[PDB]
Amino acid sequence: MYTFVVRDENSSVYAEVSRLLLATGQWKRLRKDNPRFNLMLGERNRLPFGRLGHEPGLVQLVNYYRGADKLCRKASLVKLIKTSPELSESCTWFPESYVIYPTNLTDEREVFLAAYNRRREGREGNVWIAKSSAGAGILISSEASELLDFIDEQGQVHVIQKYLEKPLLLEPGHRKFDIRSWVLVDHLYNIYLYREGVLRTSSEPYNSANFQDKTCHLTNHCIQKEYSKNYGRYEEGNEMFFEEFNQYLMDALNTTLENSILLQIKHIIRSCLMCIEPAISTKHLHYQSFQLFGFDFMVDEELKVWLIEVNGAPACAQKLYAELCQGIVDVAISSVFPLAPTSIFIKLHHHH
Amino acid sequence: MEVIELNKCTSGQSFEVILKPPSDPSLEEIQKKLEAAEERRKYQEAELLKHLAE
Amino acid sequence: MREIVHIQAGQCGNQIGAKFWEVISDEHGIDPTGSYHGDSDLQLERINVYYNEATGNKYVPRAILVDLEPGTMDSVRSGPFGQIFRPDNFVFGQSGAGNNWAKGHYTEGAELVDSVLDVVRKESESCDCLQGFQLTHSLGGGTGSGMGTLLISKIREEYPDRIMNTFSVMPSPKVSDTVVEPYNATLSVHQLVENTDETYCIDNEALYDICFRTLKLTTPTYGDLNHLVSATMSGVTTCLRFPGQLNADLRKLAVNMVPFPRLHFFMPGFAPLTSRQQYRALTVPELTQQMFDSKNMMAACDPRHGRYLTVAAIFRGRMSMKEVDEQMLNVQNKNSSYFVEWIPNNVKTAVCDIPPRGLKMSATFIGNSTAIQELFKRISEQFTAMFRRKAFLHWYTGEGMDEMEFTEAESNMNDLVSEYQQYQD
Amino acid sequence: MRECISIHVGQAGVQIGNACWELYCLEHGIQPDGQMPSDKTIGGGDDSFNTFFSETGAGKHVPRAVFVDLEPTVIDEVRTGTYRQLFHPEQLITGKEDAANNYARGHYTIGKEIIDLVLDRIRKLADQCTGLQGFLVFHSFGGGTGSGFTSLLMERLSVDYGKKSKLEFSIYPAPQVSTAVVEPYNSILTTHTTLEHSDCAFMVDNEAIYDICRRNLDIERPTYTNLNRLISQIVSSITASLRFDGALNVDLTEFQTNLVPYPRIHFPLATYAPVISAEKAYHEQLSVAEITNACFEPANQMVKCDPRHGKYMACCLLYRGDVVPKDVNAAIATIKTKRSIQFVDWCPTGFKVGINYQPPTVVPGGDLAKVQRAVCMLSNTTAIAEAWARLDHKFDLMYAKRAFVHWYVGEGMEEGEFSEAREDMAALEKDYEEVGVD
Numbered sequence A: 001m002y003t004f005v006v007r008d009e010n011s012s013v014y015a016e017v018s019r020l021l022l023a024t025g026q027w028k029r030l031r032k033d034n035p036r037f038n039l040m041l042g043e044r045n046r047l048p049f050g051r052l053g054h055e056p057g058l059v060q061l062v063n064y065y066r067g068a069d070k071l072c073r074k075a076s077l078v079k080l081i082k083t084s085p086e087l088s089e090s091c092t093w094f095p096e097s098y099v100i101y102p103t104n105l106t107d108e109r110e111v112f113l114a115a116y117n118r119r120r121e122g123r124e125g126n127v128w129i130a131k132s133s134a135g136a137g138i139l140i141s142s143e144a145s146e147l148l149d150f151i152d153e154q155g156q157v158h159v160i161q162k163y164l165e166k167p168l169l170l171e172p173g174h175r176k177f178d179i180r181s182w183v184l185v186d187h188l189y190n191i192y193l194y195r196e197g198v199l200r201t202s203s204e205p206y207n208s209a210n211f212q213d214k215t216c217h218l219t220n221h222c223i224q225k226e227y228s229k230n231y232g233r234y235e236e237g238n239e240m241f242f243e244e245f246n247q248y249l250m251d252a253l254n255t256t257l258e259n260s261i262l263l264q265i266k267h268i269i270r271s272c273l274m275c276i277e278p279a280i281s282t283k284h285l286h287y288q289s290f291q292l293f294g295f296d297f298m299v300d301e302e303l304k305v306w307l308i309e310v311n312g313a314p315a316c317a318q319k320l321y322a323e324l325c326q327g328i329v330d331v332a333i334s335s336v337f338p339l340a341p342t343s344i345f346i347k348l349h350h351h352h
Numbered sequence B: 001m002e003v004i005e006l007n008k009c010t011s012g013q014s015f016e017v018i019l020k021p022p023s024d025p026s027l028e029e030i031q032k033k034l035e036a037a038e039e040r041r042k043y044q045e046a047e048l049l050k051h052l053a054e
Numbered sequence C: 001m002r003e004i005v006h007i008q009a010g011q012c013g014n015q016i017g018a019k020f021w022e023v024i025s026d027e028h029g030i031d032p033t034g035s036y037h038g039d040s041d042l043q044l045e046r047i048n049v050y051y052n053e054a055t056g057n058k059y060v061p062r063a064i065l066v067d068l069e070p071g072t073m074d075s076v077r078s079g080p081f082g083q084i085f086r087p088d089n090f091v092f093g094q095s096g097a098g099n100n101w102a103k104g105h106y107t108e109g110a111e112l113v114d115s116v117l118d119v120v121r122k123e124s125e126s127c128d129c130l131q132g133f134q135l136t137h138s139l140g141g142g143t144g145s146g147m148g149t150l151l152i153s154k155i156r157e158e159y160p161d162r163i164m165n166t167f168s169v170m171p172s173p174k175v176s177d178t179v180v181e182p183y184n185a186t187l188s189v190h191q192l193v194e195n196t197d198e199t200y201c202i203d204n205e206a207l208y209d210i211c212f213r214t215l216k217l218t219t220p221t222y223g224d225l226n227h228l229v230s231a232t233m234s235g236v237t238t239c240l241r242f243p244g245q246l247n248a249d250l251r252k253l254a255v256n257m258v259p260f261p262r263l264h265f266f267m268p269g270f271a272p273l274t275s276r277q278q279y280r281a282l283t284v285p286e287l288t289q290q291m292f293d294s295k296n297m298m299a300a301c302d303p304r305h306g307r308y309l310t311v312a313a314i315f316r317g318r319m320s321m322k323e324v325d326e327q328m329l330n331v332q333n334k335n336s337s338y339f340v341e342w343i344p345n346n347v348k349t350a351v352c353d354i355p356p357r358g359l360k361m362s363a364t365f366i367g368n369s370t371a372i373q374e375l376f377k378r379i380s381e382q383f384t385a386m387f388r389r390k391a392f393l394h395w396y397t398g399e400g401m402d403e404m405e406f407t408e409a410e411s412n413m414n415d416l417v418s419e420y421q422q423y424q425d
Numbered sequence D: 001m002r003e004c005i006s007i008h009v010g011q012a013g014v015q016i017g018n019a020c021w022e023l024y025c026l027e028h029g030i031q032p033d034g035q036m037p038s039d040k041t042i043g044g045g046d047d048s049f050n051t052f053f054s055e056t057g058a059g060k061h062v063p064r065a066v067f068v069d070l071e072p073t074v075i076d077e078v079r080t081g082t083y084r085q086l087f088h089p090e091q092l093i094t095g096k097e098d099a100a101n102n103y104a105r106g107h108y109t110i111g112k113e114i115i116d117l118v119l120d121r122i123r124k125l126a127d128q129c130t131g132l133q134g135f136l137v138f139h140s141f142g143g144g145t146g147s148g149f150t151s152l153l154m155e156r157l158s159v160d161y162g163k164k165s166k167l168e169f170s171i172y173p174a175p176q177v178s179t180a181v182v183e184p185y186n187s188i189l190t191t192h193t194t195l196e197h198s199d200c201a202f203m204v205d206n207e208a209i210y211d212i213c214r215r216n217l218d219i220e221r222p223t224y225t226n227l228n229r230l231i232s233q234i235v236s237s238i239t240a241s242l243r244f245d246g247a248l249n250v251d252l253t254e255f256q257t258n259l260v261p262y263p264r265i266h267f268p269l270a271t272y273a274p275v276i277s278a279e280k281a282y283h284e285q286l287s288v289a290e291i292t293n294a295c296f297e298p299a300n301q302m303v304k305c306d307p308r309h310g311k312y313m314a315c316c317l318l319y320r321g322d323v324v325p326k327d328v329n330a331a332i333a334t335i336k337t338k339r340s341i342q343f344v345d346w347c348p349t350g351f352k353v354g355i356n357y358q359p360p361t362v363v364p365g366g367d368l369a370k371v372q373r374a375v376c377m378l379s380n381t382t383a384i385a386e387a388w389a390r391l392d393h394k395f396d397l398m399y400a401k402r403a404f405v406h407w408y409v410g411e412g413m414e415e416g417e418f419s420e421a422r423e424d425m426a427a428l429e430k431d432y433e434e435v436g437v438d
């Protein structure tokens, strides 16, 4: 009889995993403070990793990789890509970004301006976007003066990166979108890409001459369903799944989602996760880790994939909770605590 | 990767490698503690004996 | 040289005490005349804990036999190992206690207590470093219950910083001698709450049910119940009587078993309990499952009705200490809902190589469970059922007691129940 | 030559002392009777090994050690054991009854009655020293003597020897080899009162030693002898500089200078490699790069924790055996480009390296195999704060219910000393976080 504890009551993903675990009749849920557990569905912040793997005779597993925040933090991700030789500052799939500390607090204020002035002088598109991890607070603008002034009005670290002025627009609608990929890394550091992804599309026509209205530039499900008037017109909940999006790419662009986009996404996932493997691997550790990641991508009119950010506690598409959650139990939990296909994941092999 | 202060003798050697430059209670006071706790033990044992005498 | 002075009082106390010394004397190689005839040095290692060495290499138990009538102690002196006890350590009267706590505690018992203390003092004066005391007695009679608790109170007065341990037989209506047993048990329980560091609670009903249902004894006798108690006593004292990878005296055990001074009443048990299918080998999983089974415990309390504050387990015999840790950690990590989560690592395991006579291996269970409140609740209900009508009180008021003293004993034990109830949640 | 006096307190300290002084003798060629044929200066001399051994006129080499325990059964093994002849009776101090795993009992009740005797016996050893460096104190955290009496001794040693360095070898409590439940109380109580008196302390977590014995030595159920012979190898690696000719960590003061830039953060993490089973047919001898790389495997650390998520303040590499500097620098370079070694910005990123050509000595019939080279890495990492967090959490679970507190109050301790000691640990954890986390 395996035991587990739940320490994040706000997780829709692991609430389902917890629901499935109990369904097997072979897992027992303990009080969130009981240390004699096999599996911890830990909290989002300040998970006490230092207390895992010290219970005699208990093999303990946690659904978070200690140190993965370096990848899932806006500021940390920029620093990781620029300072990691595996990714280098010349990384071709990540937009030009700079860490900008508000003046009321290293910092890349000058470096950003030097690149900005270069674009302004070279008649090139000089539109950037500012954001931070303390957001629901985003600002898109072409003037460097406005971008920086917005960060000083705040008190948290921000990042300014190039705004993809040439996004791939779906037709009909002439509308923007981003791709969400769920990735599961198990205790052995196998990288599993969930076969099912989701496009979070904008239900408004993309307009490049007015960044004041952020409803056609931001494809977040909360903004489209709250500030957009054409929500749910072209697809239910502004969510297009791979089957539809792949058929579109064939009829419209005479290509497939695998060839034009998925190869780059798999490459980007592998590059990011392999880079931080030595820092977060639990191979020779007194406890074992796994974690589900939400990768967010952008596609431009050239069918080039761009990495936007990595979420360390992602939610799932309503229609995909059952399949993915069961997949988490199969490869991440039962692989360590076996019970008494055609996998839904795509294994991105690599050298350890 | 510099090596400094290399010292060699017949039974071994030692050195230093630099990869990157940088960026009480007195005797009396202890006695009071020991006697203080001793007094609290006596008080507790006196209350027990008072309890048993009752 | 951490000596223990053993005291047995009253009928129950002396008959169970007799069997105890019979059992361990056999385990240590001491014959009925006090001569050693073992074949292992582990038998004499900690032998001085319970025995005195006399002239001619004789070993005499450090035991004091107390009673208010001569009958039971005449049986001991005529029993199997009766000759092994010190003749001077027999302290008895002639009046009896009439199953009356007031007689053992205030009248008949008070007349004899000083002479008992003279023997206790004489045994203590010959101890290199007295660990403490252990008393065997029942709570439902008059001598072991009333005079026993009086003895404990006077021992505490004279040896305030020594550990006082008891094996206390709790009465049951199913195995009862007189109707006043709830009165005598309630009066003693308050004494024990104040003046003992550890009390092993032995319920005569649990002993009966084990003999009848598990051991398949059609008609259990007091002797059959005493076989279980003497066996249990040998199991819990194995930590002290033999050498091993444990340096534990009575005070160290108390420090790790008693988180709160009044909650020091333990549920004991052991395995195997086999009926005569008695030559089969018992695997470690079997030993561990049974040891934690309520049917193998002698307090007649279902542990699944409360929570364990602390648990100690002693395994005897040559076995897989690795497999022991696995099965022990399997019982906890499979029933952690019955262990308080605010005492880390509150289940401890000890191993002793020397098994009991006639067994390849065994396991002794010592639990400090809040389910023991069920035992005190039973006694309280029986007490109140009579006391509300003041039934049979004249036997006690006639010895100088007043009704107020019963009312307070009742309140004291109901408080003890309420104390267990708050730590169970 | 400057003398070092070793003090072994409680069961853990005494038994670890047995393993260490056995190993010391085998390393220096001293026989159980105290004789040392290689020592050509009879009854005198100021050699490096004389920091730990004095000499009688008859040529006996006597450890500069005191064994103290409140109960005699553990020290009585020394009195009749193999090395009974090394020590004289005045060096072995035993009381009548122990502290019963009760800090208050060892610190106050029993400690008050024997502390003056212990100081007198230590004073005797000090009187034989022409330039005493200080003391090495071995003890457990969980034992009532190891915790309670040690803290009292450390207080008095600071008074009677105000200018002397004091180092600790402390055994951190692990449930797999302990039947006690109150050890978190004793650990926090003794760390609070000892903190301002210890210049440098090496914690060894029994959980770590237990797992190394099961994993590397294939011991299904390790014993105290198995654990202590492994611990004494680490202790020897740490103290070899004081007993052999050298230029790194030559006196006790150098340990604080090289490992403790901040006084309260004086708990270096020890890592040792290689540990090879003697029962093995014949292990392939590991290289300098391989044993050095092993110093960054959590599995060979004396305290299980993740240094990848801390910051280093200092780092010593202590090699014994066939090791030359060329091979150390080559291995270190390869580890910088592969590992996550984050130093604090106010500390240089570097290593102090010591090499002793005599490879590790192995007790005949022991569990450890003879190796041609071994290394012990001493690094002051904020990651070791995980051990304080673990221990502090167990303290909080019990203290919230006041479980077992009456045993301590009953020995004359005030309950306020509990919360006072806990608040000091809360500040110790805050100090670690201020240095390590951004």
Ligand SMILES: Nc1nc2c(ncn2[C@@H]2O[C@H](COP(=O)(O)OP(=O)(O)OP(=O)(O)O)[C@@H](O)[C@H]2O)c(=O)[nH]1
Residues within 6 Å of the ligand: D009, D010, D011, D012, D013, D015, D016, D069, D070, D098, D099, D100, D101, D102, D106, D140, D141, D142, D143, D144, D145, D146, D147, D171, D172, D173, D174, D177, D178, D180, D183, D206, D209, D224, D227, D228, D231
């Ligand atoms: N590594 C190691 N740990 C030990 C040894 N002996 C005891 N311990 C540990 O020390 C703790 C128990 O404290 P002890 O040192 O035995 O007790 P003490 O210092 O003698 O104090 P008392 O309570 O008076 O007996 C437990 O955590 C044991 O695991 C030993 O020989 N080696």
Ligand SMILES: Nc1ncnc2c1ncn2[C@@H]1O[C@H](COP(=O)(O)OP(=O)(O)CP(=O)(O)O)[C@@H](O)[C@H]1O
Residues within 6 Å of the ligand: A095, A129, A131, A135, A136, A161, A162, A163, A164, A165, A176, A177, A178, A217, A218, A219, A220, A296, A298, A308, A309, A311
């Ligand atoms: N450089 C860039 N170019 C174009 N669009 C961008 C962009 N950076 C962000 N966006 C837009 O912002 C949205 C994602 O914002 P971001 O992910 O940075 O904030 P967030 O983390 O609060 C949303 P989530 O974490 O749920 O994906 C995308 O829909 C994308 O269209």
Ligand SMILES: Nc1nc2c(ncn2[C@@H]2O[C@H](COP(=O)(O)OP(=O)(O)O)[C@@H](O)[C@H]2O)c(=O)[nH]1
Residues within 6 Å of the ligand: C009, C010, C011, C012, C013, C015, C016, C097, C098, C099, C100, C138, C139, C140, C141, C142, C143, C144, C145, C169, C170, C171, C172, C175, C176, C177, C181, C204, C207, C222, C223, C225, C226, C229
């Ligand atoms: N287990 C056991 N219980 C006994 C024995 N003799 C009496 N009792 C129980 O003890 C209580 C009577 O006390 P008893 O010892 O006979 O009275 P005392 O001699 O005045 O102390 C009743 O609850 C009996 O069931 C015995 O030999 N074994």
Ligand SMILES: CCNc1ccc(S(C)(=O)=O)cc1F
Residues within 6 Å of the ligand: C023, C230, C231, C232, C233, C234, C235, C236, C270, C271, C316, C356, C357, C358, C359, C362, C363, C364
């Ligand atoms: C005939 C059976 N006897 C017996 C059994 C078990 C034990 S025990 C509690 O395991 O010590 C002692 C015994 F004497």
Ligand SMILES: CCNc1ccc(S(C)(=O)=O)cc1F
Residues within 6 Å of the ligand: D014, D015, D016, D018, D019, D020, D022, D081, D082, D083, D224, D225, D228, D229
């Ligand atoms: C030569 C004797 N060596 C030795 C003796 C005892 C111990 S003990 C059991 O751990 O106290 C360890 C030892 F290494």
Ligand SMILES: [Ca+2]
Residues within 6 Å of the ligand: C111
């Ligand atoms: Ca009379």
Ligand SMILES: [Ca+2]
Residues within 6 Å of the ligand: D039, D040, D041, D042, D043, D044, D045, D046, D055
């Ligand atoms: Ca000499």
Ligand SMILES: [Ca+2]
Residues within 6 Å of the ligand: B024, D158, D162, D196, D197, D198
């Ligand atoms: Ca000092």
Ligand SMILES: [Mg+2]
Residues within 6 Å of the ligand: A309, A310, A311
């Ligand atoms: Mg985000």
Ligand SMILES: [Mg+2]
Residues within 6 Å of the ligand: C011, C012, C141, C177
């Ligand atoms: Mg009777």
Ligand SMILES: [Mg+2]
Residues within 6 Å of the ligand: C247, D010, D011, D071, D098, D143, D145
């Ligand atoms: Mg001890």
